[PDB]
């Protein structure tokens, strides 16, 4: 039960990756993939708590 | 994994699987290694799946 909205790149090496990524540091956000041509187990559901 | 860092930045560190940053205490049972030299136009074509 906490919120986190961060666009800063999370480093995964030794050099400080404040704004440079591509060699050894990864972006912490990735996109979803929802195609109708996918399987039944790869379909998006609109879930509410 | 100290040999991974002091051998210059790598062009293509992109990979699918467990991140190497959390392999400090994750002891395994069996592991093998092998190397080869291939054209860089298909270095992105070496990936699982």
């Amino acid at each position, epitope marked *: 039960f906490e919120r986190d909205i961060s*666009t800063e*790149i999370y480093q995964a090496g030794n050099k400080p990756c404040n*704004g*440079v*990524a*591509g*060699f050894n540091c990864y*972006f912490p956000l990735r*996109s979803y993939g929802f195609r109708p041509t996918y399987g039944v187990g790869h379909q998006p559901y609109r879930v509410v708590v | 994994y100290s040999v991974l860092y002091n051998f210059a*930045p790598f*062009f293509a560190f*992109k990979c699918y699987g467990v991140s190497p940053t959390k392999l400090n205490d994750l002891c395994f049972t069996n592991v093998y290694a092998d190397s080869f030299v291939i054209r*860089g*136009n298909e270095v*992105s074509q070496i990936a699982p799946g």
Partner: antibody
Framework: VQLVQSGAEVKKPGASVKVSCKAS????????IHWVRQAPGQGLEWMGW????????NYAQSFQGRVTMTRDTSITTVYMELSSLRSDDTAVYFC????????????????????WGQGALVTVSS | PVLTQPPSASGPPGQSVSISCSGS????????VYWYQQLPGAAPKLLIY???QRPSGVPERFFGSKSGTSASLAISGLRSEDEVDYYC???????????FGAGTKVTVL
């Protein structure tokens, strides 16, 4: 696919252009359309993107009051309205089909333009 | 701001010519760069996306690369179609809009 649009002739400054990029070869509910201009010599300039299903238009930080958007569904076109033009950006306008649907500004990370509309020579002169 | 590009990195045909696309800290280095192919006096089109894969119909001879803050595209040999301009572009969080290149022209010798 086809991204055909009409060609507006020379118009005096202080009016609004009228060009419609007709959508064909796909469904008009999932593909974001983008509008750019290309002055000779220099590169390209980005204006904005239009949601095909709803009126959710986000504009750039270059032009805000000059450019105003509206959309339609039954005709399956797009309306251009550039009020108070100035004779300093005589450029050809292109409509570029981009794969993927997104509504927020953070979506522009895995976005590219696959096909672009053909040339429509549009300028302003007296 | 705008991406800095060389004016004309031309090269003779028969050997590879390297082109560079240097940006800023926020313009590139956190997002993915794209390279756009345009015929002279015609509409542009995309050449490569996400520095890893190419669209269908795009020849394998082409290749794209990045250096953390500068993007590089590799072409080996020039032909009757390789006398065209190369554009480099990406997206940035500083301006919350598209950032496009300046312009580069390559010609045979």
């Amino acid at each position: 696919v086809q991204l055909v649009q009409s060609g507006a002739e020379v118009k005096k400054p202080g009016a609004s252009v009228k060009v419609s990029c007709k959508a064909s070869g796909y469904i008009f509910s999932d593909y974001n359309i983008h509008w750019v201009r290309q002055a000779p010599g220099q590169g390209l300039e980005w204006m904005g993107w239009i949601s095909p299903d709803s009126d959710d238009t986000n504009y750039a930080q270059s032009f805000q009051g000059r450019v105003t958007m509206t959309r339609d569904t039954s005709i399956t076109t797009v309306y251009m309205e550039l009020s108070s033009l100035r004779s300093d950006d005589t450029a050809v306008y292109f409509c570029a089909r981009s794969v993927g649907y997104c509504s927020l500004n953070s979506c522009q990370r895995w976005m590219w333009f696959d096909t672009w509309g053909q040339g429509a020579l549009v300028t302003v002169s007296s | 701001p705008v991406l800095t590009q060389p004016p004309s990195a031309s090269g003779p045909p028969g050997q590879s010519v390297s082109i560079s696309c240097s940006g800023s800290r926020s313009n590139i280095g956190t997002n993915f760069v794209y390279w756009y192919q345009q015929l002279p006096g015609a509409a542009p089109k995309l050449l490569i996306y996400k520095n890893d894969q190419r669209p269908s119909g795009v020849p394998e001879r082409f290749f794209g690369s990045k250096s953390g803050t500068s993007a590089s595209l590799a072409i080996s040999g020039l032909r009757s179609e390789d006398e065209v301009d190369y554009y480099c572009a990406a997206w940035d969080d500083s301006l919350s809009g598209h950032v496009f290149g300046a312009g580069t022209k390559v010609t045979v010798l």
